[PDB]
Design an enzyme around this catalytic site. Structure first.
Site, PDB file in Angstrom:
ATOM      1  N   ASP A   5      -9.802   9.551   6.604  1.00 34.76           N
ATOM      2  CA  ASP A   5      -9.163   8.229   6.659  1.00 34.76           C
ATOM      3  C   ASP A   5      -9.695   7.397   6.082  1.00 34.76           C
ATOM      4  OD1 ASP A   5      -9.521   7.082   8.695  1.00 34.76           O
ATOM      5  OD2 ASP A   5      -7.818   8.430  10.172  1.00 34.76           O
ATOM      6  N   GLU A  45       1.705  17.278   2.581  1.00 36.25           N
ATOM      7  CA  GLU A  45       0.152  17.868   2.119  1.00 36.25           C
ATOM      8  C   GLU A  45      -0.808  17.451   2.959  1.00 36.25           C
ATOM      9  OE1 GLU A  45       1.496  15.533  -1.495  1.00 36.25           O
ATOM     10  OE2 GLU A  45       0.146  17.358  -2.394  1.00 36.25           O
ATOM     11  N   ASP A  91       3.359  -0.778   6.978  1.00 36.26           N
ATOM     12  CA  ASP A  91       2.255   0.152   7.671  1.00 36.26           C
ATOM     13  C   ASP A  91       1.152  -0.315   6.893  1.00 36.26           C
ATOM     14  OD1 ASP A  91       0.901  -0.572  10.175  1.00 36.26           O
ATOM     15  OD2 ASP A  91       1.771   1.247  10.931  1.00 36.26           O
ATOM     16  N   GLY A 144       0.785   9.581  19.142  1.00 39.20           N
ATOM     17  CA  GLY A 144       1.266  10.340  17.244  1.00 39.20           C
ATOM     18  C   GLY A 144       0.769  11.960  17.727  1.00 39.20           C
ATOM     19  N   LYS A 175       3.607  18.121  11.025  1.00 41.25           N
ATOM     20  CA  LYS A 175       3.605  16.401  12.227  1.00 41.25           C
ATOM     21  C   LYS A 175       4.550  16.304  13.151  1.00 41.25           C
ATOM     22  CE  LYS A 175       4.690  11.437  11.474  1.00 41.25           C
ATOM     23  NZ  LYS A 175       3.936  10.109  11.691  1.00 41.25           N
TER      24      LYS A 175
HETATM   25  N1  0FN Z   1       1.856  10.742   8.808  1.00 40.74           N
HETATM   26  C1  0FN Z   1       0.820  11.070   8.983  1.00 40.74           C
HETATM   27  C2  0FN Z   1       0.682  12.285   8.227  1.00 40.74           C
HETATM   28  C3  0FN Z   1      -0.059  12.536   6.969  1.00 40.74           C
HETATM   29  O1  0FN Z   1       0.938  12.501   6.593  1.00 40.74           O
HETATM   30  C4  0FN Z   1      -1.082  13.477   6.989  1.00 40.74           C
HETATM   31  C5  0FN Z   1      -1.536  14.126   5.889  1.00 40.74           C
HETATM   32  C6  0FN Z   1      -3.110  14.536   6.273  1.00 40.74           C
HETATM   33  C7  0FN Z   1      -3.473  14.551   6.845  1.00 40.74           C
HETATM   34  C8  0FN Z   1      -3.225  13.637   7.664  1.00 40.74           C
HETATM   35  C9  0FN Z   1      -1.788  13.063   8.333  1.00 40.74           C
HETATM   36  C10 0FN Z   1      -1.579  12.106   8.595  1.00 40.74           C
HETATM   37  O2  0FN Z   1      -1.548  11.766   9.741  1.00 40.74           O
END
Ligand code: 0FN
Length: 264
Positions: A87, A80, A126, A12, A29
């Site tokens: 996380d 955003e 997910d 990723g 992304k």
């Molecule tokens: N899928 C996805 C991404 C996503 O939507 C995001 C926004 C801010 C920081 C990291 C991330 C992700 O890894």
């Protein structure tokens, strides 16, 4: 692109970015066209983009898709990015099992995000700690990564490509599920993870068995809600409304209060 300033890689392939026009923090992304088993449209796009456009209307609960571009071998998504952010997986690694009050605030905001997606015709598929961002200043959680999602429908799903340890026994055993009930199972896994510091099941057998052992001190109501979400029978699982009216869900903190008490 001179319309965004690319910064360091978040993991990723998603990068920290800054919208040049107004310094809006963003995440950029990159999705290779090779790795797309799921396309949709309005001309040809990743389903992940279809689903994002459907959930990005208005505020919130879900990290919004602000724009996207197509490249020869890839699509680029501009999402955003709250700042500071962390996380839920790291937060749990760092802090261990969460106090129930914090877990209730978090789990609620997730419940709202998922209801939002469902209202917009989108099924995420997910939901798990890695797919949840915490905006550490507003105490707000934001769902990310519709890369395994589908259009919500009422008939059976016969494909899945999310996270196995969050997939339900009817998937493990039959390679079939319905959206909502599978989502509720993953939500049950997520909640256990918040209250226990870790996911309850590692192996298919423990999923199929769906017996929950608690490694941490967790209250009864919370344990009852978790076992409810992890009912073996998909129709014995609660609806979103039932989950949000469960006693363990009463008196949730506002996101702002949640940050002031639990996040500093
Ligand atoms: N899928 C996805 C991404 C996503 O939507 C995001 C926004 C801010 C920081 C990291 C991330 C992700 O890894």
């Amino acid at each position: 692109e001179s319309q965004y300033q690319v910064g360091p890689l978040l993991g990723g392939s998603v990068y920290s970015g800054i919208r040049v026009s107004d310094n809006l923090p963003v995440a950029i992304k990159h999705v290779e066209k090779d790795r797309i088993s799921d396309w949709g449209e309005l001309t040809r796009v990743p389903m992940e983009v279809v689903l994002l456009k459907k959930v990005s209307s208005g505020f919130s609960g879900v990290i919004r898709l602000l724009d996207w571009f197509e490249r020869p071998d890839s699509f680029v998504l501009i999402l955003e990015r709250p700042e500071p952010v962390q996380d839920l997986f790291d937060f749990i690694t760092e802090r261990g099992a969460l106090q129930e009050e914090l877990a209730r605030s978090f789990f609620w905001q997730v419940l709202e995000a998922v209801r939002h997606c469902h209202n917009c015709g989108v099924l995420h598929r997910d939901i798990k700690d890695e797919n949840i961002l915490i905006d550490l200043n507003r105490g707000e959680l934001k769902l990310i990564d519709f890369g395994s999602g589908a259009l919500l429908k009422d008939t059976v799903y016969t494909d899945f490509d999310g996270t196995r340890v969050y997939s339900p026994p009817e998937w493990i055993r039959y390679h079939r599920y319905h959206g909502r009930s599978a989502a509720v199972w993953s939500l049950g896994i997520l909640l256990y993870d918040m209250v226990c510091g870790d996911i309850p099941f590692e192996h298919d057998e423990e999923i199929i068995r769906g017996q929950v052992f608690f490694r941490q001190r967790v209250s009864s109501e919370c344990q009852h809600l978790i076992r409810w979400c992890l009912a073996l029978r998909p129709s014995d699982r609660p609806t979103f409304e039932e989950i949000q009216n469960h006693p363990w869900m009463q008196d949730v903190l506002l996101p702002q209060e949640t940050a002031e008490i639990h996040l500093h």
